[PDB]
């Protein structure tokens, strides 16, 4: 029959600043690492950049109206650091103006803001000083977080310090797929530490300012599974440490995974990054945990990622059982689909099927006492898919980049029904 969610369950959709905003060179905005990276020959498919994107900086009013039609109770978006700290030693109070306008529209339509402080658009001038590998980044982030809390505080009840440390560190500085696109494990592990430390500083600052809302981190988690024989179980443990425990353990247990740190030191040498007090600051109590879930390791979406909703069920139980009794929010979940407009409609049935499977997994967790409080679909609209540019589409709303026309997909109409019914009804 019907799978009905809790009465107070928070239904949302999510975006990120560089991915939708455009207006990259307006209002004094300085370049981010992603401006530099996308503008570098060879780094992003077809040479796509986030100059323009969905032109959301300008079109926010109409976008919010689509959100009101959808019926989301919360909209998760990110704050553009480069609009506020565009160059070394320069602060633009006006850089938060857009967010103030956006938030007014949200409140007008009874939508709660959920603001992500850092979703990867580090100002280029900080990267020029070593970026996340430099300890001084912690103070720069603190300065930005401080101004965000002061500018928006009262109007934002739900704050996310950091989006996906694994990507901002390991994928960005170690693997080199994302800005700033370096290949240096020591640098990447230094970045991981400083991202985690900056999270903790922001939480501390939030308490000290006496704000009344909630603050937490968002982690992408990719459950690993063994193929089998003791070596396969060991392989699973290595993968799990690399993707998941490297971030979960410090946040919740105030230590890095001791099984994996020797491997890190083997390939990086001494990180020379952990200072006394750091691990305590990283493990400061949060109000909630945000998780971004897409797939597992060890049929597929348009990204070629395995569809495996059981991994989400297992993951939520793992968090409950091993890590935290805090409220969990799925801050992202979604799928790429090879979408086309036929007669002004987009029939993205595969996307519907994917979200239905994941919400069923979530519903099962809730039924078994799981403290899952909210779900945000990635994404509200098609957008700049990082290294893939505009070539991959995750939206429940189609965006023609030539015309900027928004066309709600079948998935939009389906999710609207899910929200209206507060659950699955098939």
Whole-angstrom CA distances from 51 to 54, 73, 129, 372 are 9, 29, 24, 36
- Binding-site residue total for Na ion (CB under 5 A)? 5
DSSP codes of every residue in 4-32: EPPTT-EEEEE--HHHH---TTSTTPPPB
Among 74, 147, 172, 281, binds Na ion (CB under 5 A): 172
Least gap, CB of 202 to Na ion (angstroms):
18
The one segment of 119-127, 196-204, 350-358, 401-409 that binds Na ion by CB under 5 A: 119-127
Q: Does 120 bind Na ion (CB under 5 A)?
A: yes
Q: Which residue, 132 or 256, has its beta carbon nearer to Na ion?
A: 132
CB 347 within 8 A of CB 410: yes
Q: Which residue, 36 or 357, has its beta carbon nearer to Na ion?
A: 36
The one segment of 121-129, 169-177, 269-277, 402-410 that binds Na ion by CB under 5 A: 169-177
Which of 21, 127, 201, 332 is an active site residue?
A: 332
* Buried residues in 54-77 as b, exposed as e (16+ CB within 10 A): bbbbebbeebbebbeebbbebbbb
Q: Which residue, 167 or 424, has its beta carbon nearer to Na ion?
A: 167
CB 169 within 8 A of CB 177: no
**Residue 164 among the catalytic residues:** yes
Which positions from 178 through 217 interact with Na ion, judged by CB under 5 A? 178
Give the integer Cα–Cα distance in Å for 149 and 192. Answer: 23
Q: Does 168 bind Na ion (CB under 5 A)?
A: yes
Give the integer Cα–Cα distance in Å for 426 and 408. Answer: 19
Among 14, 167, 197, 361, binds Na ion (CB under 5 A): 167
Q: Which residue, 190 or 320, has its beta carbon nearer to Na ion?
A: 190
Q: Which residue is nearest to Na ion (CB)?
A: 178
DSSP codes of every residue in 166-223: HIIIIIIIII-SSTT----HHHHHHHHHHHHHHHHHHHHHHHHTT--SEEEEEEE---
Tell which residue, 283, 371, 358, has the closest CA to residue 320.
371
Least gap, CB of 164 to Na ion (angstroms):
7
| Gyration radius of the chain's alpha carbons | 20
The one segment of 104-112, 170-178, 215-223, 321-329 that binds Na ion by CB under 5 A: 170-178
The one segment of 37-45, 174-182, 259-267, 363-371 that binds Na ion by CB under 5 A: 174-182
Least gap, CB of 176 to Na ion (angstroms):
11
List active site positions.
Answer: 164, 332
List residues binding Na ion (CB under 5 A): 120, 167-168, 172, 178
């Amino acid at each position: 029959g019907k799978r009905q969610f809790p009465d107070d369950f928070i239904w949302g959709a999510a975006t990120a600043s560089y991915q939708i905003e455009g207006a990259a060179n307006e209002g004094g905005r300085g370049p981010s690492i992603w401006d530099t990276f996308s503008k570098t020959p060879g780094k992003v498919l077809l040479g796509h950049t986030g100059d323009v994107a969905c032109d959301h900086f300008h079109r926010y009013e109409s976008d919010v109206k689509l959100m009101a039609d959808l019926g989301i109770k919360s909209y998760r978006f990110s704050l553009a650091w480069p609009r506020v700290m565009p160059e070394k030693g320069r602060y633009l109070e006006s850089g938060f103006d857009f967010y103030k306008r956006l938030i007014e529209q949200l409140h007008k339509h009874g939508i709660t803001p959920a603001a992500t402080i850092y979703h990867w658009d580090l100002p280029q001038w900080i990267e020029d000083e070593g970026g996340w590998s430099n300890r001084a980044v912690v103070d720069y982030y603190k300065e930005f977080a401080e101004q965000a809390f002061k500018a928006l505080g009262d109007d934002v009840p739900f704050w996310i310090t950091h989006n996906e440390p694994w990507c901002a560190s390991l994928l960005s500085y170690g693997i080199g797929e994302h800005a700033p696109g370096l290949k240096d494990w020591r640098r990447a592990y230094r970045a991981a530490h400083h991202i985690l430390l900056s999270h903790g500083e922001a939480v501390k600052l939030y308490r000290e300012l006496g704000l009344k809302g909630q603050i937490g981190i968002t982690l992408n988690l990719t459950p690993a599974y063994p193929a089998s024989s003791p070596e396969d179980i060991a392989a699973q443990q290595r993968q799990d440490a690399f993707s998941n425990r490297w971030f979960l353990d410090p946040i919740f247990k105030g230590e890095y995974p001791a099984d994996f740190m020797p491997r890190v030191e083997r390939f990086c040498g001494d990180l020379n990054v952990i200072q006394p007090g750091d691990m305590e600051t990283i493990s400061v109590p949060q109000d909630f945990l945000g998780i971004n879930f897409y797939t597992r390791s060890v049929p597929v979406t348009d990204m070629g990622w395995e569809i495996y909703p059981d991994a989400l069920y297992d993951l939520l139980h793992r968090l409950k059982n091993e890590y935290t009794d805090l409220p969990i929010y799925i801050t992202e979940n979604g799928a790429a689909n090879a979408d086309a407009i036929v007669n002004g409609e987009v029939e993205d049935t595969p996307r519907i099927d994917y979200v239905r499977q994941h919400l069923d997994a979530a519903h099962r967790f809730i039924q078994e006492g799981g403290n899952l409080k909210g779900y945000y679909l990635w994404s509200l609209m098609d957008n700049f898919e990082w290294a893939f540019g505009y070539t991959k589409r995750f939206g429940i709303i189609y965006v023609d980049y030539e015309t900027q026309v928004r066309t709600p997909k079948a998935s939009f109409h389906w999710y609207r029904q899910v929200i209206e019914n507060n659950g699955l009804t098939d």
